[PDB]
Amino acid sequence: QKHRVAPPPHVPGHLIREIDAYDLDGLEQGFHEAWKRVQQPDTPPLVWTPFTGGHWIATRGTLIDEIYRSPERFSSRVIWVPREAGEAYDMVPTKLDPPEHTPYRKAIDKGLNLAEIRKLEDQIRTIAVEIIEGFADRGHCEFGSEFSTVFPVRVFLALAGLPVEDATKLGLLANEMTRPSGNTPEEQGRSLEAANKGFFEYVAPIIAARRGGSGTDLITRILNVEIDGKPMPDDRALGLVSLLLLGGLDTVVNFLGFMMIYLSRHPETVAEMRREPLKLQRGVEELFRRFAVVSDARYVVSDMEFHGTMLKEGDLILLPTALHGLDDRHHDDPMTVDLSRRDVTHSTFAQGPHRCAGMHLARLEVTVMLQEWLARIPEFRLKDRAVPIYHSGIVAAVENIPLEWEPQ
Template sequence: MNTDTFAPTPTKHRAPRPDHVPQELVREVDAYALDGIEEGVHEAWKKIQRPDTPPLIWTPLTGGHWIATRGVLIDEIYRNPDRFSSRIIWVPREAGEAYEMVPTRMDPPEHTPYRKAIDKGLNLAQIRKVESDVRSVAIELIEGFASHGGCDFAKDYGGVFPVRVFLALAGLPLEDAAKLNLLANEMTRPSGSTPDEQGRSLEAANKGFFDYVGPIIEERRGGSGTDLITLMVNSEINGEPIAQDKALGLVSLLLLGGLDTVVNFLSFMMIYLARHPETVEELRSDPLKLQRGVEEMFRRFAVVSDARFVVADMEYYGTQLKRGDLILLPTALHGLDDIQHEDPMRVDLSRRNVSHSTFAQGPHRCAGMHLARMEVTITLQEWLARIPRFSLKEGAAPIYHSGIVAAVENVPLVWEV
């Protein structure tokens, strides 16, 4: 086996290998700084998923934890909270322990009433009511630069469109976006060169969210508004008003989810389309194929890598796990698993039986998935109606970041006016 991809990086902090971890399962994988990331986040994750890579590998980096490398494990672990708990969902462990947002740190049945509170404003029926407003935002942004012959997609659209939509749904001022984006970046890609430093960075960002939403929660308690925050903070949990600490976590989670995931997904998708004009032509040729193809996009460009806590000692896929072990679930590796998808790096708009964990699975399946699907569909429809052919600017070098949520910046697109 060629081990070049897993060559040691001497400057990084390493955890000692536990006794129950066989040496042959150890790989040097840093979820926050993937080897080969300059070629792309998904390309870097895919290099780890070799034919001879075990279904579970262990890395001494980011505090020491397992990584599930195959789609069947990622799907199964998400669906089984009785064996794989959400009490710690971030790596390194120090960051996971500092993370205080709910209900992502909860397991059923404690999790269930909080999830119902979130779903009040994000269920499919509610999201359909705002489709025309979402479309208007997309049209306004695209028409603002369509005549220019180019834009930095990540900066001018990807980082603006979902944020404007979400802040409007939450009833928050657009000028707060920059501050909230900085906090979101530190939550999903915490700075620091050791687990302790990353834990402190995440703790500070978590506090920043709580400090921001605290006064807003107080102001909207008892209110009759229809914005997402008012709906949530006036929900009852087991027949009682939601407690302040839980409201802080719930509203902060809402903002974190709305400000980081779709923002980055859109840019990954557009980089691919800019490099594959034949796929763009196929999307333009058939409105129905475009709508159906959105699910294929979600398979191909998953951005989340969160973790689960092993509840008890067990043997899992031939590997000994101990209570307290953490397993990272890179959702990209489900969608890119060639055991489940032929030629998985290619966007195939005719692909059948598309399976992925881009929105997770089980009780923590993403509450914002209906909004995300709408935002991606509308972006493709309105962009291609106004900019039917486009490419990456010659010499463009997108800058990729891995982490709990993968990110990309510097996405210069050009087109003929």
């Protein structure tokens, strides 16, 4: 049974569309495909759905980009739907606007900046090779369970100085943050609340132990950056370290699954990467354009008209980032990966002050993964008649990716 809310007085009937971000129409065909169904040639730039507590959805890339770049008009005070979940959400600094946001972002950047991430290349490669070597000679693997859910998690837990055996419990918390269970706004709010609490419970002892610590791990490094000349307060630290874990353990895992399903179906594209290693390197951003996974929100700060649409203070707008990268008004033949595409502009990492702090790490993990994968398994396909299983929500997910190849 689908939970509906009535439209508020300012929402006109002609803008209503029945879109369920947590179970998109057509999702069985793919997450990206399902979002693209919403972006028809004449669909309005902003549409309102009665599902998920009632909210707007931006349907074109230019709006998504603008909204992310405009924190004074579209606040991060709520960035999740349903509203109840967004109000429960307590991660730092994603819940903050400038100026409060900026010293926390500075702190994160001390740990995640490009120069720091470059130092991690060898560690990341070692992890990728070890995993791949486990099945390269076999001729098959279930890529989800055997690689994409393993590689980025081992990388991040190592970087954060955390035990690899915590992967399961942290993954379960992540799932309930980005794809909270429930079929009512209130149920989903309770799910997210519980997940966010689990994260705080996990991180609290780590923070206490690493304040003033001598560890060289990511958490000690970021935790001990002063905020306005003083140690970071406990409340902020909980949200910050939890966010690092959430970002570190969910997004790349799911990105890789979508990417690999596509590559398994496009052997010509794989072959280009194999024949031209610089095309691979230079082509990774095209992959980010093509395989967006985040659909999150902003809070309308003031009554306004935006792209011909009347918005009220407190309205939530969902930003399905796939609808920037895959917008046919921005990219010709948007569903094809063209490694030589000159303009790859996208909002896969959002825009504005919150533009992903992990983007350098994400790019490196993907680059290294592809390099070490193709070195060892140069050709591969999706098992005949296999059907991946798709999930939509704040972060998309995919499972069941059985790959096959002739061992080299």
